[PDB]
Amino acid sequence: KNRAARVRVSKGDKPVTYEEAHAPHYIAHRKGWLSLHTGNLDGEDHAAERTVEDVFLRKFMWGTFPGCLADQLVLKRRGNQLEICAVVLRQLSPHKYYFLVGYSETLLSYFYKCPVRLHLQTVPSKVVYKYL
Amino acid sequence: HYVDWRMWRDVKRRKMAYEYADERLRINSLRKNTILPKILQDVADEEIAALPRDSCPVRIRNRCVMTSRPRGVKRRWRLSRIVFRHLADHGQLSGIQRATW
Amino acid sequence: NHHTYAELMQTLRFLGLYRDEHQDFMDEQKRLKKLRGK
């Protein structure tokens, strides 16, 4: 059996999002890529250093938005403009939410050396595509 | 704070190949000649030998960037054949697909 | 640089702005090893 990015059927009470219900042979067939940048087109350099920054920003924000991140982020990239988009649960107080935008915006501005802008989205519950 | 002691054996071999890179570019520009006859080219051969280990770029073995395997590496995306394959199946590099041909 | 990436995340747990689950997984597990071990 191949077990690369599937969640396995167990019962009827396990909920799952659209993305991680989809197996990795659907990457551009039924899914989109979770992060956009100009690296893998040929022949372009700077495909290499960027993805070891790309893996930090979804391991940074898994910890600085703790308990509330709905699914994986979307890390768009427009020239010298890193555009993070995120859908986040409606569980925290908004005074906390506005704190860690400008916390993480100007700490990710001063790490990548670019501007970074966050666009949060609020959903009340985790959006479930499949009751597997 | 490298993931092994092994990577930090190899970070030393990429910074000490880098400051001593100018020297190894200029002294080893003095061997690969036909001109400047052999006594002029054999006392320069001792000085590279007395230049140490961990300085030549052959002592690097070209390693994966986060799990430190020495082989099974993909050079364009920096990472080994497993942990790059871990991210390509959640869709986390721009434009990596399964090839069905 | 792997010190730049890994020591900044050390202090951002120390100032508590980033709550990581792996090193939480140690210092609770290391709590319950020192109760007996060591």
């Binding site: 930090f56 | 490298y2 993931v3 | 995340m9 990581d20 792996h22 939480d24």
Partner: peptide, 20 residues
């Protein structure tokens, strides 16, 4: 390093061992 460090929902699954 940091790039070793991981989530919780993979960590308890590798520590509980609920399948054979």
């Amino acid at each position: 390093s940091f790039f070793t460090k991981l989530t919780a929902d993979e960590l308890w699954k590798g520590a509980l061992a609920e399948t054979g």
